[PDB]
Design a protein around this ligand. Structure first.
Ligand code: SF4
Ligand code: SF4
Ligand code: SF4
Ligand code: SF4
Ligand code: FES
Lengths: 666, 79, 72
């Protein structure tokens, strides 16, 4: 049938034969008390607050773990159930030490709300005054075990959703406790990624983000806006909470998607920490070791005066940010690429972008999409990490890797000259020596398409024949492998093709493309390429006498890029913050809107666009970015010719299905 | 006495700070072939944050001098 | 010695690698040959079976037969 119907509280509800009673109740509107239930986690059955009874049967059934069967009458509210639930809440309060007066979650705690809805004004039990540890060793997260209901939703979030299995239960019985690795404090645990997925999963105020205590209460917010995390390419959906013009809490929407709502340390620490920064708010001038306030006319006049006297002598450049939206990039490109005919328009991440694209183009000319969705790592069997460190570039990808290798029985092998970014999950660390190992790798995978020689192709790879032999032996025994190619490999557009060829040489196909899943550092990769990113590297080579640098000062920049900016003899930055690395190397420091103040679409690598919503409206009146672009177009003798956005063109089309072709273009 | 001042290779002053706040700005990189370390400005790393010290770097970072016959030659050095 | 137990428990986890189970017998045999489960033993068991440290400490402290400190 797959279409059943029940009667909850007299109200007839519809559902499917596979769900539980709590799911059928939540599906329409119906309310049932829950404390250990979390959408996105397998039902646990610990609080026993969701108890429910049928007519005739005097037994009590947990609505969250008992399946729904057509024809049953469900009763959620009566004297017996109210009494039992109040007794459970009173046990929870009398067992542990609940001090609502100074709890950080003292207005948005599930236990406190369940206690107030059941009219709890006494505990009726002797109030065991036991000493529980308060763990504040980690500067960011606090675990106050005086407030634990032992719902285990923290142990289920760090195991099935995150992968960093840092939490579990200590000694059984009433002495149950949530511990870190080997009973250590959270700060001594090495298997923690500081993602805060546990803080979002905890219903009580045991796990708490420390720096936003007493402010990040969802009950005393002013507005809730959902948008996307701009920091990395994964683009996790968020649930920003705003209070008095400040982001107090970032929660992960998407408890239905494979990410599970876990955001990275950046997504839920930097974004609320960004709204309380120094906010340039007025054009500055260096004046020598100490900035000075200036009007817009003065700052723009001096900036354009130094910009003209350098553009005539071929020496000028622009370093834009790929965390910018498609409209800002379109305007920048309209000024620099289609109005000034400039040639030095690189991006802070232009090298990774140009490398990935020039390594994947050997496959665009034959009609194959040379990558797949990042969430297929869970369905794989052998994950090969090629010059990647996802814990610093794409934490949700690292979470997929950990979940697959620790709970879905996958094998991990490293193929990089690095620190083996997963020291304890890899079983084959293949460290390549530098030089020209790209042709070596491509000839090595050539044998896997034909014979499936090796010694000759395993000399610059710095592997004795045996090492490369069993590398190939494990690569051939895998039915659905996957490769993770990092941004280091983009130091040469050859190694990207080498990885994409190792992908075809082992039949790593998916219905969306190959098993390559590149780790892009920004989200507007295709947008930046089509608009701003240059074709040849020029930073650190051209001395440069003038430089425009638009940097949304959110993610750090490579030391080399900043050293090239420091030697440019004039830099005009249009950052919104007064952070250290940009106020150190800057001459004007014009103000610009922050990421939580403008809207955009973020044309991505895999095709169709995302959408960033404006969370907090702009405070002051900076009044434009087109203004600066015209005062640079004027004072220089050009027209801007305002264009509209270029459409998403799906650069890598899936024309023909999974018909591999080794590309001898080395 | 005075404050520590680092000048970019083209004249701009980059992180003029107070001497006691040096652990926030200077770090030493160690190389296997020398008992000598390599100090560098931390915000630019190694080997990009490395700078020069000495008479040349002093006269380049300082803006003026306080003695007559040395100023009369500091001008000729600056030009 | 803390270095003796490393290899000594390596030789006890050897017959169990890649066999989908049998962790409480490993802990039982490390208890039989040491009288208690030290932190080094648990760390090496976790590193060899590639089972998280939280899991091995949770199952080691679940049963009353085991002991995390040297016994009298
Ligand atoms: S966790 Fe909830 S019930 Fe416990 S003290 Fe804090 S607000 Fe009160
Ligand atoms: S911060 Fe993340 S990794 Fe650490 S315990 Fe919490 S959920 Fe697990
Ligand atoms: S810390 Fe929070 S989520 Fe974890 S068991 Fe205790 S109450 Fe539940
Ligand atoms: S993984 Fe990327 S998209 Fe997700 S929260 Fe972190 S930075 Fe944002
Ligand atoms: S909520 Fe139904 S048993 Fe915990």
């Amino acid at each position: 049938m797959k279409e059943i119907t029940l009667t909850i509280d007299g109200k007839v509800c519809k559902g499917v034969q596979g769900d539980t009673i709590l799911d059928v109740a939540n599906k329409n509107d119906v309310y049932i008390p829950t404390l250990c239930y979390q959408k996105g986690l397998t039902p646990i059955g610990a609080c026993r607050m969701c108890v429910v009874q049928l007519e005739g049967n005097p037994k009590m059934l947990p609505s969250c773990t008992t399946p729904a069967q057509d024809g049953m009458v469900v009763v959620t509210k009566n004297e017996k159930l109210k009494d039992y639930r109040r007794q459970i809440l009173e046990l929870l309060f009398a067992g542990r030490n609940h001090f609502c007066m100074y709890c950080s979650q003292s207005g948005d705690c599930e236990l406190q709300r369940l206690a107030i809805e059941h009219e709890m004004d006494s505990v009726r039990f002797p109030y065991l005054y036991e000493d529980f540890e308060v763990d504040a060793t980690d500067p960011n997260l606090m675990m106050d075990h005086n407030r634990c209901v032992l719902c285990q939703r923290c142990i289920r979030t760090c195991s099935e959703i995150v992968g960093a299995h840092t939490l579990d239960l200590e000694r059984r019985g009433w002495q149950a406790k949530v511990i870190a690795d080997l009973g250590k404090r959270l700060r001594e645990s090495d298997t923690c990624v500081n993602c805060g997925a546990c803080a979002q999963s905890c219903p009580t105020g045991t796990i708490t983000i420390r720096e936003f205590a007493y402010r990040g209460r969802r009950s005393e917010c002013d507005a809730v806006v959902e948008s996307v995390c701009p920091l990395c390419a994964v683009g996790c959906k968020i649930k920003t909470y705003v209070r008095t013009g400040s982001i107090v809490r970032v929660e992960g929407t998407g408890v239905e998607e494979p990410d599970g709502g876990q955001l990275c340390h950046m997504g839920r620490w930097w974004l609320p920490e960004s709204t309380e920064r120094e906010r340039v708010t007025v054009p500055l001038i260096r004046e020598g070791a100490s900035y000075r306030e200036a009007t817009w006319e003065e700052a723009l006049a001096l900036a354009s005066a130094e910009f003209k006297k350098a553009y005539d002598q071929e020496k000028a450049g622009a370093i834009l940010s790929s965390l910018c939206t498609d409209e800002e990039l379109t305007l920048f490109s309209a000024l620099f690429r289609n109005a000034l005919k400039m040639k030095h328009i690189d991006t802070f991440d232009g090298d990774i972008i140009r490398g990935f694209f020039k390594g994947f183009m050997p496959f665009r000319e034959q009609g194959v999409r040379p990558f797949t969705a990042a969430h297929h790592i869970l369905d794989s069997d052998l994950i090969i990490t090629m010059f990647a460190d996802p814990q610093k570039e794409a934490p949700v990808v690292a979470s997929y890797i950990r979940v697959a290798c620790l709970h879905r029985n996958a094998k991990l092998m490293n193929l990089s000259y690095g620190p083996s970014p997963f020291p304890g999950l890899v079983d084959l660390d293949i460290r390549l020596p530098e030089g020209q190992a790209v042709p070596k790798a491509l000839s090595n995978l050539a044998e896997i398409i034909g014979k499936i020689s090796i010694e000759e192709s395993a000399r610059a790879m710095g592997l004795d024949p045996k090492i490369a032999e069993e590398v190939a032996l494990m690569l051939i025994s895998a039915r659905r492998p996957i490769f993770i190619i990092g941004g280091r490999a983009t130091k040469s557009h050859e190694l990207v093709t080498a990885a994409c060829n190792l992908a075809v040489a082992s039949k790593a196909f998916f219905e969306d493309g190959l098993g390559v899943v590149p780790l892009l550092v920004s989200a507007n990769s295709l947008g930046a390429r089509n608009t701003v990113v240059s074709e040849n590297p020029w930073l650190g080579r051209e001395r440069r006498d003038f430089l425009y640098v638009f940097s949304t000062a959110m993610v750090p920049e490579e030391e080399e890029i900043l050293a090239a900016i420091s030697a440019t003899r004039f830099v005009v930055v249009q950052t919104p913050f007064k952070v250290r690395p940009l106020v150190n190397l800057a001459d004007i420091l014009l103000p610009a809107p922050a990421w939580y103040e403008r809207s955009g679409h973020f044309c991505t690598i895999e095709g169709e666009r995302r959408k960033l919503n404006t969370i907090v409206p702009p405070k002051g009146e900076i009044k434009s970015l087109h203004y600066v672009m015209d005062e640079f177009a004027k004072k220089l003798g050009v027209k801007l010719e305002r264009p509209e956005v270029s459409p998403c063109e799906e650069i890598f089309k899936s024309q023909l299905r999974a018909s591999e072709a080794r590309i001898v273009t080395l | 006495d005075g404050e520590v001042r680092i000048k970019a290779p083209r004249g701009r002053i980059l992180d003029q700070f107070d001497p006691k706040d040096y652990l926030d700005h200077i770090g030493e990189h160690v190389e296997p072939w020398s008992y000598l370390k390599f100090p560098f400005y931390k915000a630019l790393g190694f080997p990009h944050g490395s700078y020069r010290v000495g008479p040349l770097a002093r006269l380049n970072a300082a803006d003026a001098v306080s003695t007559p016959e040395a100023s009369k030659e500091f001008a000729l050095y600056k030009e | 010695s803390t270095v003796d137990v490393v290899e000594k428990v390596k030789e006890i986890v050897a017959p169990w690698k890649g066999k989908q189970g049998g962790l409480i017998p490993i802990l039982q045999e490390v208890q039989r040959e040491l009288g208690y489960l030290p932190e080094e033993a648990l760390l090496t068991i976790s590193r060899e079976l590639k089972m998280p440290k939280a899991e091995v400490y949770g199952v080691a402290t679940f049963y009353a037969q085991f002991h995390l400190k040297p016994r009298g």
